[PDB]
């Protein structure tokens, strides 16, 4: 009664028989915005079930040489579903998330993925190699939406910070000999009650292989990793027309 679990939100239900408990980001469940914390004077929309549900957005293939991937969050879920819509029509957005990364293999396979939540995950460039050029990461890299982006220098999280310390962030590992999925529940985290789901990304989801995937030849070599996230306590205010970016 700790390795098996079921997550049910909206009209979606995730099952898992090898999970390793659930992490609750910074030990705080997602809440709605207080009356004294808010400033936007208009009564917000709380679609509830139409947006607070499990969107299974992407699948990556883990290979004996994969570097790792990340997904910026507020964004990843735009354009997809009713959530996407409310995020485009409204200026202000607010919401916590239930992230469930899954990836299974056999008892004869081995490997270990680090799954973390890095708030305000600002990306940096290699500065033209030498460090004299003041380059900047492109829209395609800082806000990749679904499909995420692949890391080029995971050791420093493409941002000059050691991944060795990335665990001071809500994390969970996917050790194949132990489990087959991670489950983080992040609350809304920003220095503001609401912000634009479009141009600001509250945090990134990191999935990095720290202990390389490996298996004797002959065992199914296609080992996918699938991301499934679900917004929680979604609130929207500041209604205008629909906006893409």
Annotated binding site for Ca(2+): 58, 147, 216
What residue spans of the chain are helical by DSSP H?
73-76, 81-89, 139-142
Q: Say what the alpha-carbon torsion angle 97, 51, 245, 229 is, to the nearest 10 degrees.
A: 40
Distance separating alpha carbons of residues 210 and 230, to the nearest angstrom: 26
As to burial, measured by CB atoms within 10 angstroms (0-12 exposed, 13-18 middle, 19+ buried), residue 139 is exposed
Question: In the 8-state DSSP scheme, what is residue 82?
Answer: H
Q: Which residues are annotated as a binding site?
A: 58, 147, 216
Largest CA-CA distance found in the chain, in angstroms, rounded: 62
Residue 41 has, within 13 A of its CA and on its CB side, a CA count of: 0
């Amino acid at each position: 009664s700790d390795r098996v679990a079921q997550l049910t939100i909206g009209n979606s239900t995730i099952t898992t028989q090898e999970a390793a408990n659930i992490i609750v980001g910074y030990g705080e469940w997602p809440s709605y915005c207080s009356d004294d914390d808010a400033t936007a004077v208009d009564k917000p929309t709380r679609p509830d079930v139409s947006v607070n549900r499990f969107y299974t957005l992407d699948t990556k293939l883990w290979e004996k040489s994969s570097k790792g991937w990340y997904w910026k969050f507020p964004d990843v879920l735009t354009e997809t579903g009713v959530f996407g819509q409310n995020a485009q029509f409204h200026y202000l957005y607010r919401s916590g998330f239930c992230i469930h990364v899954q990836c299974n293999a056999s008892k004869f396979h081995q490997g270990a993925l680090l799954v973390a939540i890095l708030p305000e995950y600002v990306i940096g460039t290699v500065a033209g190699g030498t460090g004299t050029e003041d380059s900047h990461p492109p829209y395609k890299q800082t806000q990749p939406g679904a499909d995420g982006f692949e890391l080029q220098h995971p050791y420093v999280l493409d941002a000059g910070i050691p991944i060795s310390q990335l665990t001071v962030c809500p994390h969970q590992w996917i050790n194949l000999r132990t489990n087959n999925c991670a489950t983080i529940i992040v609350p809304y985290m920003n220095t503001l009650p609401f912000d634009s789901a479009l141009n600001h990304c509250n945090f990134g989801l990191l999935v990095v292989p720290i202990s390389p995937l490996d298996f004797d030849q002959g065992a199914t070599p296609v080992i996918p990793i699938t991301i499934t996230l679900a917004p929680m306590c979604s609130e929207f205010a500041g209604l205008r027309q629909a906006v893409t970016q």
